[PDB]
Amino acid sequence: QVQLQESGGGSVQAGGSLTLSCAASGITYCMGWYRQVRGKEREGVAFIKTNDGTTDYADSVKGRFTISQNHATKTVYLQMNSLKPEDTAAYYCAATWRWSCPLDPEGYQYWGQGTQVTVSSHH
Amino acid sequence: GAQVSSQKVGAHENSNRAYGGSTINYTTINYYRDSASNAASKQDFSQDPSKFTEPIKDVLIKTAPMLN
Amino acid sequence: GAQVSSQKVGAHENSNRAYGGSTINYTTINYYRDSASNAASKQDFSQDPSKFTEPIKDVLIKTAPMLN
Amino acid sequence: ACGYSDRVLQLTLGNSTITTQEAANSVVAYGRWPEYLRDSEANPVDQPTEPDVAACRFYTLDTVSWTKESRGWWWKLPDALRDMGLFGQNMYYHYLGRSGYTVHVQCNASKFHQGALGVFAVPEMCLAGDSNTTTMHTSYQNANPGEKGGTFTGTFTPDNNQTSPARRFCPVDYLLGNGTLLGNAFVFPHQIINLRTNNCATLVLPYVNSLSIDSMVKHNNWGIAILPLAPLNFASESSPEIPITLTIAPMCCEFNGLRNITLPRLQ
Amino acid sequence: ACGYSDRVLQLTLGNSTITTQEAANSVVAYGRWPEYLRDSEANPVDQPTEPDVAACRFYTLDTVSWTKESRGWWWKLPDALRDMGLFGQNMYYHYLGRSGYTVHVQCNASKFHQGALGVFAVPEMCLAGDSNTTTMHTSYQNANPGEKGGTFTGTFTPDNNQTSPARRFCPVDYLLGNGTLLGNAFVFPHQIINLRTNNCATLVLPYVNSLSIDSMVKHNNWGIAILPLAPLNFASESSPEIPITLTIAPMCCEFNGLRNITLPRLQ
Amino acid sequence: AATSRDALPNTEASGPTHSKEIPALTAVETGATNPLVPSDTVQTRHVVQHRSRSESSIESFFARGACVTIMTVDNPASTTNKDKLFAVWKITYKDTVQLRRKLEFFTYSRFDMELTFVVTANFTETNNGHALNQVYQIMYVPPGAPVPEKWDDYTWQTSSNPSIFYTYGTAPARISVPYVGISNAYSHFYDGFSKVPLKDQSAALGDSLYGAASLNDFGILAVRVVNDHNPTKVTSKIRVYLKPKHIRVWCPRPPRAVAYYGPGVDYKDGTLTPLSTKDLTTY
Amino acid sequence: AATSRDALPNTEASGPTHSKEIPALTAVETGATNPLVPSDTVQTRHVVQHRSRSESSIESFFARGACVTIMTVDNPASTTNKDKLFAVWKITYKDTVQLRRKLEFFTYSRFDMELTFVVTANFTETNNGHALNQVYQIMYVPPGAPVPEKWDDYTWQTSSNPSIFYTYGTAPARISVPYVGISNAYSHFYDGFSKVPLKDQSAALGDSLYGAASLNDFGILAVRVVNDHNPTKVTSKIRVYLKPKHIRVWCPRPPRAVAYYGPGVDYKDGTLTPLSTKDLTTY
């Protein structure tokens, strides 16, 4: 019964890059399949398998984000680059062991508290 | 009146001077009067899937034309 | 179908009229159908460390010159 | 050599004979062929009437039509043949009876037609009800449609009349009517009348149940479900049509317990 | 008896299998069937790599179209299969190599189509040049069109550009491209896909040359020339069309002289 | 002769071919499934195969014990307005899903039932009350036998009813029951009606429910707390685990596709979509 | 012929020498380790040796049961805002250190796993609350099987999942599992990638983690408290002890020198100093 925490999130300008950390309780990756689902409301971004590889990204963000696994610390990150005002969203992290279901927000069992990221239109 | 049967050895212990090698057998003694009460042997058979695969009246030869 | 095996006697009890002396053996009966379930015999072999010590193609004679 | 072809076949029982020139041989279900109850497996004590020929003959039930918008068809045994000559009579006249069959589903077209019909034989073809309000409530009158048979549907429609429900089967084709996947139905004895190949079907089904001999009026053994695997298309015609006919013949039939005639409320 | 028909055939080599229901049997060229070089007739000294399955498998080259106004097609071996998996690789990696084949020209239509295609196998199919100004000057790039293949023509067209000639084959169909009469081509191993009869072709051609083992990149053994014997006519349609496909499979292949990779200027 | 733990058919070496034999060609119209092994469509090497179908044998497939039912009981205070809740349950596998679905691949069967009872307990009121180790009674009431009316009536005297007195906190209770089927095999499905509507009668008197019978009627289990009323209300749950052993089955059927609804073959609406979206031309 | 409990080679009496034989001279360039016994470099007496390598046999070395994981669960009040914590753990030896390091001296292996479960419990709140002896369920969910979502969902019905109902305060739970490896031996190390990055694809779709595979994937364990909510929160820990039995291994490697960091062969900085200070010319 893992417990997520959204850390390393804040304000930045447009064009830059920011990193997001997602440490977890346990017996972390044991619930498996960590995710990154943004949106002010609900919308995926990154998905990842605790084992093997096994990346995949939302078509809308494809080629600018990356989700990584630090099994030792038990933290899952999210490197967001070339930010643009439309990236100012409510970031969260998720998990479900079910080795599938990455295309449904309500398919999950675990959720953290969140961290608001702001891509300030400076330029 | 015991029932000694054989086991299909899996991971053979670096032995043939007791384990692994020489056939490993197990004993089984029934303690109750009812057949229901008996343990599950597991030494069950296996048959040809023909009563499903070839439910046909005539005989099938896998090299000749099916419909002749 | 029991498995009676020998033991390497350590501290021999002032006996040879039962213990210590006359070879001491132990019985072993398998109670489960699976090999996994079996006890660890421990009566394992031992080999020559040559597949590590002398991984050489030619034969080594410990009295002659190594490189000739 | 002398022309023994798998498509050319002749079936004969009693005073009826079926011939076919486009067959895919015949299917002897589960490898068993009909026989009478063995003294070993016997149950009741009385003397068994073996009508044989009298009951063992091909009966052509009514013919249905196969067009594009057809979803499917379903027949029960010994239901359908409850109105068939002597077999029908002797049936009502007893309490226990076992009977085998030889379903000969016929359905021909031309070289210019295309499609496939899946003739399945499900032992104990239990179909589902029509309402989400009262389960297992389908009445007998609709459960035994007889020779007219029942029909499948392409969408589930719940019955909302709780005043006086319909009490009938509402079987959705892709679920065989029993909630499983139709694609797996190819486990029960079957044949596919894929127009191009053959023009009929043949499945001899032996007596299967959990009992050695059981009540016929009450219990139905084999279920004949014919659903279109491939749609019927013809030339460049918007409404093609060919007929489907079935002629199931009982085999190794016997009956125990002669009583007075049963008159069941059918409607 | 058990249905062994000359039209029903199955070919298999390595990890590929061709099946056909409308064949005219198969033609074993000159009566010989593929085999490896005999120690007796051997030439080079090194160890021969026999790729077998790795190279001995059916490769489908690109598909062409057959309409009314088609004059013909021509393929070279081992040319065409110079871009085919391992066989292609090992080839470039050596100086000497011998290989047999099994050309399986496929081409089906309907009972309503008519015509004939002459699939010929000319050992050392040497085609002619396009100009009356410089003989034997056709460049390599056009000589080895590869899997796209070369095409025949119905009228001789001389190349008049002496500034920078075309340097390609200009083969006129009625002359097989080599100046002989096409009607006599029925001396080389061949089969005729006369629509009504069969729907494919099959010619196993053994290794023929004057040498025991020779260079592949440089020398081409067998020539596959497909020309329409009878024109393709359909119903009352002015532009009928059916596709032609070939799948030649090497047999009893071996290679001698492992060197560095050859990279030939293809264009 | 062939057993479960036997090695499967050894792959034989096969080479090039050009013959009048046609392995690859069938016609599923015959109902017959074409039997093609590796050495047919492709050239295969000789393989001394080692894999056995041991774990896939009928007995092995049902070799686990499933959770059939959860029965709730308690031991309320002597001062409570309500009666001491004792559980009564109709003996059937159907109440849950898992065990049922597995038993659905076949039309019939015979199997000696083995039962397990892992009981649990707990207090309920916010009182630091005390409860001694509780005793439990599991009573098998066959069809048409005295089913208890109270937690303390003559019925539990069970001069003829096979019962089980379980003392909380010990190795779970277990009993074995052979094939009690009225038939030759227990029918998991039954196309029919226990009654036949008649003509010189009334629709009421000849109406019966489709799919059911006496076949699947074996009796009920009655569970209570043998200890009397205690100053602190202590509830309890009785989990029944059933495991079929020494099993045989007849005539396969496809597994249950959509979600269950009732003991019948029936299905509810909105649960009629078993599959998902996936392109025809995408891997 | 030589077993574990056999006496080592007997020392033979050797005397003075002056010959063309050169025992002492080697050249480790040959990779071969010079085999020199006592009676070579020095004159030795005849010794009927008695020491045996019995306890150093493969089986004996791993003959202890190690602590692989600690799983926490509880039984909170029916009134709590949080959900009843049930544990889920990915089956692996790696999580700790000891058992892992020992399994690291070799490149491969085969061993029937034997498991032990020493469960413990305790209260948590400063309330003189009561709790009856608790029941525990240990559930083995193989790869890609229904992993529970709640402490009380259909999953635990386990019609096919091998589970273990442990009644607190009794002789610890135990099960044996043979070689479930997908290979011929379980790979403790794996040089590679489960996927191969391709060219007509994207870096995202062909990215994989180095060192991992399905080899070391066997499933997870799900543990809960079968008893319902009780007026007093009672936490619990599940210790899993694994012991390899009937073991074989292939190709030695040097033991793990520096402190572990992750399931990979990776190492953190600051922990790169395994040794200490000691003079070259001092004893």
Ligand SMILES: CCCCCCCCCCCCCCCC(=O)O
């Ligand atoms: C002390 C407890 C005794 C229990 C006695 C056994 C009760 C019989 C239950 C049999 C369940 C088998 C279900 C099969 C139903 C069917 O398919 O017809």
Ligand SMILES: CCCCCCCCCCCCCCCC(=O)O
């Ligand atoms: C009831 C519990 C059942 C447990 C089922 C067994 C789970 C298998 C665990 C195997 C651990 C062996 C680790 C080896 C990994 C490797 O080196 O590849």
